[PDB]
Amino acid sequence: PHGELQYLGQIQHILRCGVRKDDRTGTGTLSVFGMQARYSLRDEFPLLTTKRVFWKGVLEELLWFIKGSTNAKELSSKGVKDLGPVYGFQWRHFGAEYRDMESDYSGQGVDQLQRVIDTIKTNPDDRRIIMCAWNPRDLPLMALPPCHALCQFCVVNSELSCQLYQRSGDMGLGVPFNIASYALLTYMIAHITGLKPGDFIHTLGDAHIYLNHIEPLKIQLQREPRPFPKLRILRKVEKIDDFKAEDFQIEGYNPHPTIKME
Amino acid sequence: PPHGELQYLGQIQHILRCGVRKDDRTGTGTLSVFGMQARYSLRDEFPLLTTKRVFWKGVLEELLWFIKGSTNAKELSSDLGPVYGFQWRHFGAEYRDMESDYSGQGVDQLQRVIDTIKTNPDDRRIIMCAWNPRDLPLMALPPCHALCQFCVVNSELSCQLYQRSGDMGLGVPFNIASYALLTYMIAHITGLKPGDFIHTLGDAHIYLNHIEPLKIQLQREPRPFPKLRILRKVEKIDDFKAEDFQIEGYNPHPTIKME
Ligand SMILES: [Cl-]
Ligand SMILES: [Cl-]
Ligand SMILES: [Cl-]
């Protein structure tokens, strides 16, 4: 049974049973609380096929996260179209006093990403191989604000798995993109630690669909998934920071047409 | 609808069939899988498991002890350092002695969850976290052991517990009851009806010496879940006492000893 069927099943469930609800913008959503799906990474890559997912943006934004940048210019000029302490800065300089987008951060804060990599290497049985990220807007809001998302990695025999917990997920636009991003991150980490990719498990608290996305998703629901493509890494790479876009090749990606979602 | 306990029994079976033999922090083996989730309705029933007798008195008593923020082993019987309770009520405050005065120190995560449900029922950040105390001196900014996310839908309150690892034999049935209980308490305080308790795990493991007891537990048919009654209108989370709670129609199979 095709992994994408979980995603399509979840969309349908929210359309049928979702509760109408308002969020921080004046846009309506349908909402359900608590979801989980498991995508195999073993000889395949969960880049969704019921619509064309913008792979180049996934790869480029992730590399941008990884180099710890807080500058929109470094991502725009790659063709994906000062951001403050965004996810990337938190991954590489967790808990450091944020200055400018070109200040010197070398070895300040906790490098959560290198720490995940080091722990996989020093204790593959460790149940604490965890990275967290905060929505930057929460940071001045209150003392000790809760994280927006966390990733827990797990080594089982020679396979590396990842579970992403997000306190809320945009099922229409954000989720397919994130399935791809964190599956890619798992491939990168597995590669660097000499492990094979296992599963990506995606878990949500608030799983919502925007009202203006209902019609496109209803049509997406009538399309049959095609076998997932493969991700090939073209070069032995030894450090997370050494990966570049050209090291990656998606092979056999055969998707249905792009669906625009506002 | 199918019985909620069948999720737990299915998960036990799955770990026995497909789980990987591993080793945890101690010299005891486990069978283990990564990533699990179950959803237990709290609507006119309470998910206290029936395929074995769960020690309800200990669930209730330990939870009240967590809630009053105590770090004293004696107060529960019948100094642990900054255990789960202290973190719930005094998050981030420098822990010292157990008889020390912790008033207005740290963040009261529990009261904050209660206040947020009251000030913004749509908020997606109604979250509290707890750390294994042993991790605290191990490294800088260690990750949490567990998190609870609460969610108001119309007038129902739901809770999702994420634990980075769970003992499926001993710890899970007990935690299902504790966090379902906590949701009932918070729902009561905030004028809401309990909704769902969602239990999500990273490492879900069974200790090797529990395999035989669980295999036997797997042969037992769940009986309908009991109800939980709260016996008086209670105003604040700190005012609940053991005698305010009454489990009704608990009809379980016999105690299974595990350890
Ligand atoms: Cl996309
Ligand atoms: Cl028990
Ligand atoms: Cl546990």
Numbering used by the authors:
A (entry chain A): 27 to 107, 130 to 310
B (entry chain B): 26 to 103, 130 to 310
Authors' text:
Human thymidylate synthase (hTS) is an obligate, stable homodimer with two active sites, each including residues from both monomers. As a dimeric enzyme, it provides the sole de novo pathway to deoxythymidylate (dTMP) synthesis in human cells by catalyzing the reductive methylation of deoxyuridylate (dUMP) to dTMP using methylenetetrahydrofolate (mTHF) as the one-carbon methyl donor. By interacting with its own and other mRNAs, this protein regulates its own levels and those of other proteins involved in apoptotic processes, including bcl2, c-myc, and p53. Its inhibition is usually achieved with compounds that bind at the protein active-site, competing either with the dUMP substrate, such as 5-fluorodeoxyurdine 5’-monophosphate (FdUMP), or with the folate cofactor, such as raltitrexed (RTX) and pemetrexed (PMX) (Carreras and Santi, 1995; Jennings and Willis, 2015). Here we report the discovery of molecules that bind at the hTS monomer/monomer interface and, despite their small size, markedly shift the monomer-dimer equilibrium of the enzyme towards the inactive monomeric form.
We selected the ‘Y202 pocket’, which accommodates the side chain of F59’ from the other monomer, as the most promising region to target. We therefore made the Y202C mutant and screened for compounds able to form a covalent disulfide bond with C202 from a library of organic disulfides. We made mutants with single point mutations at C195S and Y202C to test their functional and structural properties as well as the double mutant, hTS C195S-Y202C. Panel (c) reports the omit map (contoured at 3.0 σ) showing the S,S(2-hydroxyethyl)cysteine (CME) chemical modification occurring at the mutated residue C202 in the single hTS Y202C mutant. (d-e) H-bond interactions (represented as dashed lines) involving the CME202 residue in hTS Y202C subunits A and B. (f–g) two views of the surface of the hTS Y202C dimer. The two symmetry-related subunits are shown in violet (subunit A) and orange (subunit B), while the CME and S-methyl-thio-cysteine (SCH) residues are represented as spheres. Only SCH43, appears fully solvent accessible, with CME202, partially visible in its pocket, just below SCH43. Panel (g) shows that SCH180 is partially solvent accessible, while SCH195, CME199, and C210 are buried to different extents below the hTS surface. Four molecules, A5, A10, A20, and TPC also bound peptide (D186-R215) DLPLMALPPSHALCQFCVVNSELSCQLYQR (sequence C), containing the engineered Y202C together with the native C199 and C210. In agreement with the described computational and crystallographic data (see above), Y202C is the most exposed of these three cysteines and is thus easily available for disulfide-bond formation with the RS fragments, being therefore suitable for tethering experiments.
